[PDB]
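Researcher: Here's my situation. A collaborator sent me these components and asked whether they could plausibly form a single complex. I don't have experimental data yet, so a predicted model of the whole assembly would be a useful starting point for our discussion.
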Amino acid sequence: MQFEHLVQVNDRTDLPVLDRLQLWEGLVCRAREPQYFVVGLERFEILVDDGDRLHRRLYLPGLVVEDEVVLKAPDSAHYSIKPSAEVAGGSLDMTIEEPEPGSLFVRFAYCTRYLQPDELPYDAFVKQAYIAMDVETIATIRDRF
Amino acid sequence: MQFEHLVQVNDRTLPVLDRLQLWEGLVCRAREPQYFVVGLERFEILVDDGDRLHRRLYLPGLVVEDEVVLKAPDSAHYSIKPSAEVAGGSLDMTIEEPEPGSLFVRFAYCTRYLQPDELPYDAFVKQAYIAMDVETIATIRDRFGA
């Protein structure tokens, strides 16, 4: 079960332009300061902070989530949840792509794992919700950085 | 499986909404998805039976077709039939009103496959649904509190 969406960072237009390191600071920001990107969030802890490796608690309405985030500067961010009895696990990767200087993209890669195990596709409601969030994320980074 | 999420519509503070305005909001989301769907490039209403629409949405790198059933003034039910290569599913939006002026919208999601252990959504998906539902109510409030 794998979904991938490429978001174009800069265009010809009103809106601000981004360099690679600015884009990267954005991804860090998304990892360390999720209140600026997560609609609904009520609070969050950084339970463990090893610099490039974070373990977090996210308090959303009627739901608490713990995850791990691995940062590899200045290229990518990997979010992951280990599955248990009740919760399905999964991961998100955000990876900077740069086919040429100033030409920046971010690939968002989503995946879902179960404790238990046919390969299974996401449905279009989920894909629609992922695209929306990936786009809002880049818009926010573009607006802060 | 199923994920459900309840969004509170009005608060103590932003525009207040009555039952019928929020209903108009949900119709609006069905018939005018360009105000709600981050990313959409175009859409068509292929079949319009009034309370029942078949639609085509054009998202980047993705075409979606679905049906929408409207039951005024209570709910909108969105559904996609699954095929060999896409998974189906449904979204129900239901207005709840414990007391006059106290309004909520329950969002309920389902996924089905052609061939089928019951299966939970992970939290990336739950977080994304939560985000959309809250943005949907925000949009209605901006367009119909106005």
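Model: Some features of this prediction you could bring to your collaborator: The CA atoms of residues 75 and 94 of chain B lie 4 Å apart. The two ends of chain B are 37 Å apart (CA to CA).
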